[PDB]
Design a protein around this ligand. Structure first.
Ligand code: ATP
Lengths: 51, 94, 39, 154, 194, 70, 286, 139, 52, 152
C-alpha cells in the first residue's frame, strides 16, 4: 500500500508503479460491478489517502 | 399495326375506329394501362397518346418474312461497322 | 509531344559501361559463398 | 518442384563421385544454398525436367480464362462517368499546383539529393502522369463504345 | 485581388501613404463596386459599421455607392462623371480610368436588364439616363462587343433579352487559355534545342 | 535496468511530443494526483503549457453537487 | 433459383484428360462423370470430379449404366480426404446433347437436389466459351406432353482461384495481352464484342430456317420475345438525345484536350532534363 | 519481358516477412531499419515500394533470413486499439458533473474547440495548446 | 438580389420561372489548371531559357 | 371498397356516395358507420377526409398517366372550382409528394416534366442493356427447340 514517497530508494519506484496500477484498476474507466474488495490492516497510518 | 416510327395515335382516331365519344376514351385507356395490355403515356392537350409497349400477339408464316427481312440488313450493319473495327484497329493488337 | 520525344534521344551518348557487379568482388563473393558452403 | 532421388551412401564412403556426366544437360540449374545445407547431393540428386503440352490444351485454356461477354458494349454508369471525370480532375488541380511547386527548386542542389530527399513526401511528376493515363483510358473507351451502338442499334 | 487584399479595412491603419484613412475607404469601395456582386454588396459594404461611418463624412461617395444599391439609376451617372473625372485626374488610377467606367456602364446595364424581358428601349431615357440614340449606340457596341446578354429589337421599339446557360461562355475562356498556353509551350519549344 | 527502461520510456514520448507540426489535431490530456514527483522538463512549453488544478469546492459549488446527487 | 456456375481449369482439364484416356476406343464413347463440389450464397461451385464407367450401344439407345459401387467407394474416399468436398451434380462430354442426358439426371437426382450437368468441349473452336450447364425444370403445362421436362441453360463462366492462377499462368507461357490501357478493351470486347453479337444475330437466323420447310411446331413460345426485340429497338435520331449526345461528347473532349495539353509539357520537362545531361556532360568527360 | 520479371521479385515477401521499422536511408534504394527483435540493420529494399509511402513510423516488412525491406505496412497498435465506441463510453453526462463551471468550459476551450474551430486559432494566431496537465486532490 | 430568380413582364405581369443547376464544377476546375501550368512553363525559363 | 382504392380511376365523389353513402345505416353494421355519421365534426372530418382520399386517388394516377392535361378538364374531373383545384395542387407540391408545373394563363398543367440532361441517354443505355439481355434470352432457347425434333 504505502502512502507515497519523495523517491528515496530504488525499490519503491516500481512498487509505487504497482500500486498506481491498482488504483486505476479499482475505479478508473470501468464499471466495477459484482467484484467486492475486502481489505484488512493493523495500521491504517502508512496508507495512501488516494487509496 | 403502327410501326416503330411513330405509334402515336389520337383520340379522334379512337373515336373513329371505335365510334365511342371523346369523354370515354380516356376511361378506356386508363383501364388498358391498368390491365397492362398496353404501356404508353397520355397527352390530353394535343389529344395524342405515346404508346410504347403493346401486348405481344401470335402470327402466321407471313410475319416471319418481314422479321426475316428486317433481320437481314441488320446483319450487314454489324458486318460493316465491325469491318472498320478490324481494319482501323488492325495494328493495335496482332 | 512527339517532337519533344524525337528531339530528345541525342543526349543519350557516352553511356560507357554498365558493369554488372565486379570481377574481384564477384570472385570474393563466390569465395564467401564457398566458405558458407564449407561451414 | 525439383524432383530428386537417393544416391548410395556406400559410394560416399568409397569417396567415388557418381553419375558420370555424358551430356551437358543436368548441370544447367543451380541448386539452392538451403538444399545444399541438406543432403540433396551427399544423399540425393536433382533432375532437370520440363512439361508436355499440346495445341489440344493450349487453345482450350487460352480462349476460356479471361473472356468478356457483352461488357464493353455498355455505357458504364452514364451519370457517374462524367462525375468521376471531375472526381479526378479536382485534386489533379492541386497536384498540378505541386507541379507548380517542385519544378521551382531546380537549378539548386544536385538531383541525386532530389532522389534521396523525396522519400517522405509525394512527387507531382509520376502521380501527375498517372491520372493522365487514368482519365484518358476512362474516357476514350466509353466514348467509342457509346458511338458504336448508334450505328448497330438502328 | 485588389479588393480581396482590401478585405479587412479594420486592421488597416491611419497610414503614411494614405494619410487619410478615408482615401483608403474610397479606394476599396471603388474597387469593391466592380469586385463583388449584390449578395456581397447587400451584406458586406452595407452592414459594416466601420465602413458606413467613414463614408458618413462623404456626401458624394455615399450617394455614388447607394444610387446603384437603391436602384437610383438616373442620378448614378451624375456622380459617375464626378468620380470618373476625379479618377482621370488621380494618380495610379490614370492607367485605367478609361477601363473602369466602361465596366461600370455594362454592370449598371446588365443589372437592370436582367430583371425584365419585354422592357422597351424608350423606357431607359427618362428613367435611366437621357438620350435614346445614346442608349442605342451604347448598347450596340456591347452586344456587338460580345457581352450584355440580350437581343435588342428596333422597329417595334423593344429590347429583348435571352439567357445563356454556362456551356458556351464558360467554354470560350477555355479555348482562350488553351490557345494562350499552346502559344507559350510552342514558342518555348521553338526556342530550346535551337 | 528497471529504471533505465523507464528512462527510455520518457525519452520516446519526449521526442514524439516534439515530432508535431501544429497541423494535426492530436490533443494529449494527462491527469495525475501529485505534481511534486514530476520532471519540469516534461513541463516545458511546446509540450506542456496548460495546467489545471482541481481545488476543493467550499460551499458554492458544493451545494450544486448536493443538487445533482440528491 | 441458381444464379450461375463457377468452373475451375483443373476440372476443365480433368475431363479432357479422360477424353484422352478413353480416346483409344476410336469408334464412340462419351465422357460421362460425376461432378463434385459445393454451392454457397446461391453461387454454384465446381472443384473436383471423376468419370464413371459408361458404355452405350447405337441400337436401342435408352439404356445406360453407372457403376454405383464405384460411385460410393471413390466418393467416400473423396469425403474422407476432403470433408469440405461433396457432390454437386454430374457432367457429360457434350458434343451435341445425347439422348440419355434426360434421365441420367433423374437416375442420380437422389444424391444432389440440383444434380446439375456440364457440357464441355473436346474439339475447342468458337468465338466464345465452350462451357455449358443446364438446370432441370419439369412442367405439367397446357400444351406439349402431360409429362414434360426440358433442361434450361443457366449461364456459364470460368471461376478463378488464387491457388490455381499460379499453375494456370505458369502453364500458359504463350501469349497474354495484359498491360490493360487504352487497347485491351478494344480487342477483348470491341473487336471481339461485335463478333459476339454476330453469333447471337445468327442464332435467330438459324431458328429462321423453318419459314415453310423446317420443323413442325411453329412458334407459341418463341415470338413474344422476337416481337419484343423490334418493339424494344432503341430510339431514333430526332430528340435532344442527339443534342445531349453532342453535349456529353463535347464535354468529354474537354477532358481529353486537357490531359493531352498536359502530356507535351511533361515531355518538355523531360527534354530539359536531357539537355542538362548533354551540355554539362560533354565538357566534363569529353 | 520486363512485365514478367516485374512480378517475379515479390517471391521473397511470402508470409514470413520481417517486421521491422524504417529509420533512415544512406542513399537511393538502400536503407537502415530497426527490427522488432531489438537490433538495427543496414538493409536493401524492394524496388516496387513507393518510397514516398515511407518515414513516419509505419512498420516495414523484413525477410526472416536475408533481412531486407519487403513491404510497407498499415499502422498497428495493440495497447487500446481505438476505444471501440459502442460499449465503450462510460455514459457520464456533462450534467452529471455539478459545480465545475470554470474548468468544464476551460477544458472545452483547450481540447475540442481547436479541434473544431481550427481556423479561428489559425486566423487570430494565438498558438493553441499542444497538451494539457490536470491534477489536484483525489476524488 | 438573386435570392429568387425568373423574369418580370410589364405588359401584364407574367413571371416566367425556370431553373436548372448548370455545369459549373467541370470547366473552371479544369481551367485553373491551365493558369497553373502556364506558371510552370514560365518557371521552365528559370531552368531552361537561362541555362541552355 | 378496398377494390376501388386498389384498382384504377374512381367515379368522382357523387357517383360514389349515391352508391355507398347509404349502406352506412343499413345491414347489421351501422355503428362505426355512425361514428362516421353521428359526430358531425369528427364525422365531418370523415366526409372531408374521405373526400380527401377520393379527390386524391384521382390525382395520383393523373400524375402517373397524364403527361399534360388542361386545368378545366381536371377541375371537371374533380367536380369543383378551378381555384379549389389550385388549392389542391398547391399544398401537395409544397408537400412535393406529387410534382406538377401548373399554369394560370392557358390552364396547361403537366406532371413529371424536368429538364432531363442525363436521363435521355441514360435510360437509352438502360434500353441497350435490356435489349442485349433480351437477345441473350432467345439464343440458348432456340438450339434445344431444334434438339427436341432433330436429335436422332
Ligand atoms: N460533480 C462532482 N464533483 C466531484 N465529485 C463527484 C461529482 N459527482 C460525483 N462525484 C464523486 O467523485 C468521484 C470522482 O471520481 P474520479 O475517479 O473522477 O475521482 P478522481 O478525481 O479521478 O480521484 P482518483 O484519481 O482518486 O480516482 C466519483 O467516485 C463520484 O462518486
Amino acid at each position: 500500500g504505502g502512502r507515497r514517497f519523495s523517491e528515496g530508494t530504488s525499490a519503491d519506484r516500481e512498487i509505487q508503479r504497482t500500486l498506481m496500477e491498482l488504483l486505476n484498476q479499482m475505479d478508473g474507466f470501468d464499471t466495477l460491478h459484482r467484484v467486492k474488495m475486502i481489505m484488512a490492516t493493523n495500521r491504517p497510518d502508512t496508507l495512501d489517502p488516494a487509496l | 399495326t403502327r410501326p416503330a416510327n411513330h405509334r402515336q395515335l389520337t383520340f379522334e382516331e379512337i373515336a373513329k375506329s371505335a365510334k365511342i365519344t371523346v369523354n370515354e376514351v380516356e376511361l378506356l385507356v386508363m383501364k388498358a394501362l391498368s390491365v397492362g395490355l398496353v404501356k404508353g403515356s397520355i397527352d390530353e392537350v394535343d389529344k395524342r397518346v405515346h404508346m410504347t409497349w403493346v401486348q405481344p400477339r401470335v402470327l402466321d408464316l407471313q410475319q416471319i418474312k418481314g422479321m426475316k427481312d428486317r433481320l437481314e440488313f441488320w446483319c450487314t450493319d454489324v458486318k460493316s461497322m465491325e469491318m472498320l473495327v478490324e481494319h482501323q484497329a488492325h495494328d493495335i493488337l496482332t | 509531344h512527339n517532337m519533344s520525344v524525337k528531339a530528345m534521344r541525342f543526349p543519350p551518348k557516352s553511356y560507357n559501361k554498365d558493369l554488372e557487379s565486379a570481377e574481384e568482388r564477384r570472385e570474393r563473393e563466390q569465395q564467401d559463398l564457398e566458405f558458407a558452403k564449407e561451414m | 518442384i525439383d524432383a530428386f532421388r537417393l544416391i548410395n551412401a556406400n559410394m560416399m564412403v568409397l569417396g567415388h563421385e557418381p553419375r558420370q556426366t555424358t551430356s551437358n544437360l543436368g548441370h544447367l540449374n543451380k541448386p539452392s544454398i538451403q538444399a545444399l545445407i541438406h543432403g540433396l547431393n551427399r544423399h540425393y540428386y536433382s533432375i532437370t525436367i520440363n512439361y508436355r503440352k499440346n495445341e489440344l490444351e493450349q487453345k482450350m485454356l487460352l480462349n476460356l480464362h479471361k473472356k468478356s461477354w457483352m461488357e464493353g458494349l455498355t455505357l458504364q454508369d452514364y451519370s457517374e462517368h462524367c462525375k468521376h471525370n471531375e472526381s479526378v480532375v479536382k485534386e489533379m488541380l492541386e497536384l498540378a499546383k505541386n507541379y507548380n511547386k517542385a519544378v521551382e527548386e531546380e537549378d539548386k542542389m544536385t538531383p541525386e539529393q532530389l532522389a534521396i530527399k523525396n522519400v517522405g513526401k509525394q512527387d507531382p511528376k509520376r502521380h501527375l502522369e498517372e491520372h493522365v493515363d487514368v482519365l484518358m483510358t476512362s474516357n476514350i473507351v466509353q466514348c467509342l463504345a457509346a458511338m458504336l451502338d448508334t450505328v448497330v442499334f438502328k | 485581388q485588389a479588393a480581396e487584399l482590401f478585405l479587412d479595412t479594420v486592421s488597416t491603419f491611419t497610414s503614411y501613404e494614405l494619410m487619410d484613412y478615408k482615401t483608403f475607404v474610397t479606394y476599396t469601395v471603388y474597387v469593391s463596386m466592380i469586385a463583388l456582386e449584390r449578395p456581397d454588396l447587400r451584406e458586406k459594404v452595407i452592414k459594416g459599421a466601420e465602413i458606413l461611418e467613414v463614408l458618413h463624412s462623404l456626401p458624394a461617395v455615399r450617394q455614388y455607392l447607394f444610387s446603384l444599391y437603391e436602384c437610383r439609376y438616373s442620378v448614378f451617372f451624375q456622380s459617375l462623371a464626378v468620380v470618373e473625372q476625379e479618377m482621370k485626374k488621380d494618380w495610379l488610377f490614370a492607367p485605367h480610368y478609361r477601363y473602369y467606367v466602361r465596366e461600370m456602364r455594362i454592370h449598371a446595364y446588365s443589372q437592370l436588364l436582367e430583371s425584365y424581358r419585354s422592357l422597351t428601349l424608350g423606357y431607359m431615357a427618362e428613367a435611366f439616363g437621357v438620350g435614346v440614340e445614346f442608349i442605342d449606340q451604347e448598347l450596340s457596341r456591347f452586344i456587338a462587343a460580345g457581352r450584355l446578354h440580350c437581343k435588342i429589337d428596333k422597329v417595334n421599339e423593344i429590347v429583348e433579352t435571352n439567357r445563356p446557360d454556362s456551356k458556351n461562355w464558360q467554354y470560350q475562356e477555355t479555348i482562350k487559355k488553351g490557345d494562350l498556353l499552346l502559344n507559350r509551350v510552342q514558342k518555348l519549344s521553338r526556342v530550346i534545342n535551337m | 535496468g528497471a529504471d533505465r527502461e523507464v528512462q527510455r520510456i520518457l525519452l520516446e514520448l519526449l521526442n514524439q511530443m516534439d515530432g508535431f507540426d501544429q497541423n494535426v489535431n492530436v490533443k494529449v490530456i494527462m491527469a495525475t494526483n501529485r505534481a511534486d514527483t514530476l520532471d519540469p522538463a516534461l513541463l516545458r512549453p511546446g509540450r506542456l503549457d496548460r495546467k489545471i488544478e482541481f481545488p476543493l469546492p467550499d460551499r458554492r459549488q458544493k451545494r450544486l453537487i448536493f443538487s445533482t446527487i440528491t | 433459383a441458381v444464379q450461375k456456375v463457377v468452373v475451375h481449369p483443373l476440372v476443365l482439364l480433368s475431363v479432357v484428360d479422360h477424353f484422352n484416356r478413353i480416346g483409344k476406343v476410336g469408334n464412340q464413347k462419351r465422357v460421362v462423370g460425376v461432378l463434385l463440389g459445393s454451392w454457397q450464397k446461391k453461387v454454384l461451385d465446381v472443384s473436383n470430379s471423376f468419370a464413371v464407367p459408361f458404355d452405350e450401344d447405337d441400337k436401342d439407345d435408352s439404356v445406360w449404366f453407372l457403376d454405383h459401387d464405384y460411385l460410393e467407394n471413390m466418393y467416400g474416399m473423396f469425403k474422407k480426404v476432403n470433408a469440405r468436398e461433396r457432390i454437386v451434380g454430374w457432367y457429360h462430354t457434350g458434343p451435341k446433347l445425347h439422348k440419355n442426358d434426360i434421365a441420367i439426371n433423374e437416375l442420380m437426382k437422389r444424391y444432389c437436389p440440383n444434380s446439375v450437368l456440364v457440357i464441355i468441349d473436346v474439339k475447342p473452336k468458337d468465338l466464345g466459351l465452350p462451357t455449358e450447364a443446364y438446370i432441370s425444370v419439369e412442367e405439367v403445362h397446357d400444351d406439349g406432353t402431360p409429362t414434360s421436362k426440358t433442361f434450361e441453360h443457366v449461364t456459364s463462366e470460368i471461376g478463378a482461384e488464387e491457388a490455381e492462377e499460379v499453375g494456370v499462368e505458369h502453364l500458359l507461357r504463350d501469349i497474354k495481352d495484359t498491360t490493360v490501357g487504352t487497347l485491351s478493351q478494344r480487342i477483348t470486347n470491341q473487336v471481339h464484342g461485335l463478333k459476339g453479337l454476330n453469333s447471337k444475330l445468327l442464332d435467330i437466323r438459324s431458328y429462321l430456317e423453318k419459314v415453310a420447310t423446317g420443323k413442325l411446331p411453329i412458334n407459341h413460345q418463341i415470338i413474344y420475345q422476337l416481337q419484343d426485340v423490334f418493339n424494344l429497338l432503341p430510339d431514333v435520331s430526332l430528340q435532344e438525345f442527339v443534342k445531349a449526345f453532342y453535349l456529353k461528347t463535347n464535354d468529354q473532349m474537354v477532358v481529353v484536350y486537357l490531359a493531352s495539353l498536359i502530356r507535351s509539357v511533361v515531355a518538355l520537362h523531360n527534354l530539359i532534363n536531357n539537355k542538362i545531361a548533354n551540355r554539362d556532360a560533354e565538357k566534363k568527360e569529353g | 519481358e520486363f512485365l514478367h520479371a516485374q512480378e517475379e521479385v515479390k517471391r521473397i515477401q511470402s508470409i514470413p516477412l520481417v517486421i521491422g521499422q524504417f529509420l533512415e536511408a544512406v542513399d537511393q534504394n538502400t536503407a537502415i531499419v530497426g527490427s522488432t527483435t531489438g537490433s538495427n540493420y543496414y538493409v536493401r529494399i524492394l524496388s516496387t515500394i513507393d518510397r514516398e509511402l515511407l518515414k513516419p513510423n509505419a512498420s516495414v516488412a523484413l525477410h526472416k533470413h536475408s533481412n531486407a525491406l519487403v513491404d510497407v505496412l498499415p499502422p498497428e497498435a495493440d495497447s487500446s486499439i481505438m476505444m471501440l465506441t459502442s460499449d465503450q463510453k462510460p455514459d457520464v453526462m456533462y450534467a452529471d458533473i455539478g459545480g465545475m463551471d470554470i474548468q468544464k468550459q476551460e477544458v472545452r476551450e483547450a481540447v475540442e474547440l481547436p479541434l473544431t474551430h481550427f481556423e479561428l486559432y489559425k486566423q487570430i494566431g494565438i498558438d493553441p495548446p499542444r497538451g494539457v496537465l490536470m491534477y489536484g486532490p483525489p476524488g | 438580389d438573386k435570392k429568387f430568380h425568373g423574369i418580370l413582364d410589364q405588359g401584364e405581369g407574367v413571371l416566367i420561372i425556370f431553373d436548372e443547376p448548370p455545369v459549373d464544377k467541370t470547366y473552371e476546375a479544369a481551367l485553373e489548371t491551365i493558369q497553373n501550368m502556364s506558371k510552370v512553363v514560365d518557371s521552365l525559363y528559370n531552368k531552361a531559357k537561362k541555362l541552355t | 371498397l378496398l377494390k376501388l382504392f386498389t384498382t384504377m380511376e374512381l367515379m368522382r365523389w357523387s357517383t360514389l356516395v349515391e352508391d355507398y353513402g347509404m349502406e352506412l345505416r343499413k345491414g347489421s353494421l351501422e355503428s362505426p358507420a355512425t361514428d362516421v355519421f353521428g359526430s358531425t365534426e369528427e364525422g365531418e372530418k370523415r366526409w372531408k377526409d374521405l373526400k380527401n382520399r377520393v379527390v386524391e386517388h384521382n390525382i395520383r394516377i393523373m400524375a402517373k398517366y397524364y403527361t399534360r392535361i388542361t386545368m378545366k378538364r381536371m377541375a371537371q374531373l374533380l367536380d369543383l372550382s378551378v381555384d379549389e383545384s389550385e388549392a389542391f395542387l398547391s399544398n401537395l407540391v409544397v408537400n412535393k409528394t406529387i410534382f406538377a408545373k401548373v399554369d394560370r394563363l392557358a390552364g396547361i398543367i403537366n406532371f413529371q416534366r424536368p429538364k432531363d440532361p442525363n436521363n435521355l441517354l441514360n435510360d437509352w443505355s438502360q434500353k441497350l442493356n435490356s435489349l442485349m439481355s433480351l437477345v441473350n434470352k432467345t439464343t440458348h432457347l432456340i438450339a434445344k427447340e431444334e434438339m427436341i425434333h432433330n436429335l436422332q
